[PDB]
Design a protein around this ligand. Structure first.
Ligand SMILES: Nc1ncnc2c1ncn2[C@@H]1O[C@H](COP(=O)(O)OP(=O)(O)OP(=O)(O)O)[C@@H](O)[C@H]1O
Ligand SMILES: [Ca+2]
Ligand SMILES: [Zn+2]
Lengths: 424, 149
């Protein structure tokens, strides 16, 4: 309707540092293909791009420019193709029905096996189905719907993410796609082989909820330290079992219940003594002393038993075991610190030039204006796409310079720690 | 409290949180990220469900629990999957050792002794040592976050 509005919307500007180290502003029209870029991809790139040793994200942005262009082309083709576009747009929905179906199937299995919002309405329908058709038939229908929905969901996933664009090998490499095919296989196994196979599907909660994944990251980030602490605990258990076998074999008497004497020796062999110690002392608050025979004061080995029990309790139960929890808390603190630093940098730094907000105080151009218009990462991406699309003969001066820098793999054309408005 | 029943006045003791700011700040450690704690509890429930499924499939007989009958002294607690899940959730999580505490003590000559040992150790390490302590770790982290803010 408004030529000025249309042209302003479709016109962009960027700032480039020339060879003579002078800044210039290039005003260019937005390439048509750029319109197909997705907000989800934009947000993922913005929140995932990592600083380099020098502290600049420009290298990663430039590296991912080509993948972004390929994604734009694939999105244009997907929009051209109607039905698969309709399926792709509703990716979240399909995941929702899949998760709800898995939860309901697992609840029914838990509450009946062995056998023979719209959520309240779905629950009532399932209850009526159980009442009329039966538990088994209801589970069969639920599993069939789950499998169909998951097939649709994987189709929508490939349509939206466009993982196939990179290549078949890349598609196989992607971990999320493998997780999804594993989900399909588990659903098939649950439907056809055994109903209890649906239990594994409850692991989808970690994938769905970001908070739970962040919580588990506390355990996974430094799992090597936890495993090494467990190995140290095993070594200490081995030494304690050696000492017990040599000096305290008789005390190792474990009561047992025999399926159709009530006490059996447990330290006749060092392997058995190790197994007993590892299984019981580590799982007992007191330690190995609780399982070991209660000594009388008159007994000669009473001080030896007291020292043995107290040493085990202090060394293993109180120190070694608590070190794993200390490591988990430590990882929690590290993760929080890293997240806070990243959020602060993202909020109070410019992506392209890296200038801080304070530098823009008492200036004609605000920091918000700088980030929105003067230094916009998507404007730089659009300029790169323009350079790639445009023919060499039609290049202008700045376009030729930027194309030569791109060919030579030089990123200096990006403005670093410099802003034209701040200078003037 | 005045009319229906005298014991209704017990609820009024919650006014201490409102009156004291320090207690409210302490509880804020639990409440600020309560969603994470609830999701951790849900993960613990899922792991308990899987462990109960495994026990029902392979270790049904070991689930013998003693009972005191109001006017046999043992019962089978894993005859049905719901009962097995209830037993695991109620006892293993509340026992320091884990489910192996309530589970029957196996003899060495028994062929399933290594399987039972692995089951007990895996439950203790995955659930009791790691999952149950994640809630306390979350609370500790929330304390530091509140202090920094
Ligand atoms: N260099 C940058 N530094 C910091 N934040 C940036 C930078 N470039 C873009 N952003 C932010 O990233 C998001 C993308 O901005 P964008 O130009 O797409 O705005 P938009 O509101 O989605 O678009 P429009 O209003 O023109 O339809 C906005 O939050 C913008 O502030
Ligand atoms: Ca020319
Ligand atoms: Zn900038």
């Amino acid at each position: 309707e408004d030529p000025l509005a249309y042209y302003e919307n479709h016109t962009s500007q960027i700032e480039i540092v020339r060879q003579d180290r002078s800044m210039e502003q290039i005003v260019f029209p937005v390439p048509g293909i750029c319109q197909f870029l997705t907000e989800e991809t934009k947000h993922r790139l913005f929140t995932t791009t990592e600083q380099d040793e020098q502290g600049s994200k420009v290298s990663d942005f430039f590296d991912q420019s080509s993948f972004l262009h390929n994604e734009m082309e694939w999105q244009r083709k997907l929009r051209s193709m109607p039905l698969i576009y309709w399926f792709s747009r509703r990716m979240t929905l399909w995941g929702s029905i899949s998760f709800n179906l898995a939860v309901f199937i697992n609840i029914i299995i838990a509450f009946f096996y062995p056998y023979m919002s719209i959520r309240p309405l779905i629950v009532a329908l399932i209850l009526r189905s159980i009442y009329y058709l039966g538990i088994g038939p209801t589970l069969n229908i639920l599993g069939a719907l789950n499998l169909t929905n998951k097939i649709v969901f994987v189709v929508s996933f490939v349509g939206n993410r466009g993982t196939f664009i990179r290549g078949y090998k890349a598609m196989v490499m992607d971990m999320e796609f493998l997780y999804h095919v594993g989900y399909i296989l588990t659903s098939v196994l649950g439907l056809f082989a055994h109903e209890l196979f649906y239990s594994i599907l409850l692991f989808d909660l970690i994938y769905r909820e970001e908070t739970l994944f962040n919580v588990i990251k506390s355990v996974t980030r430094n799992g090597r330290s936890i495993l090494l602490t467990a190995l140290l605990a095993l070594i200490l258990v081995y030494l304690f079992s050696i000492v017990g076998f040599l000096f305290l074999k008789d005390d190792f008497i474990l009561e047992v219940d025999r399926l159709p004497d009530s006490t059996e020796r447990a330290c006749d062999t060092l392997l058995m003594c190790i197994v007993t110690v590892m299984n019981h002392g580590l799982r007992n608050g007191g330690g190995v002393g609780d399982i070991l025979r209660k000594p009388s004061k008159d007994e000669s080995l009473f001080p030896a038993r007291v020292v043995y029990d107290l040493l085990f309790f202090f060394i293993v139960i109180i120190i070694v075991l608590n070190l794993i929890f200390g490591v988990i808390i430590d990882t929690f603190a590290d993760l929080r610190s890293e997240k806070q630093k990243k959020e602060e940098i993202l909020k109070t730094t410019c992506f392209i030039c890296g200038l801080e907000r304070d530098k823009f105080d008492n200036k004609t151009v605000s920091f918000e204006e700088h980030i929105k218009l003067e230094h916009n990462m998507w404007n730089y991406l659009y300029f790169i796409v323009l350079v790639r699309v445009k023919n060499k003969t039609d290049y202008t001066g700045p376009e030729s310079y930027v194309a030569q820098m791109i060919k030579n793999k030089n990123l200096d054309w990006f403005p670093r720690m410099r802003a034209m408005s701040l200078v003037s």
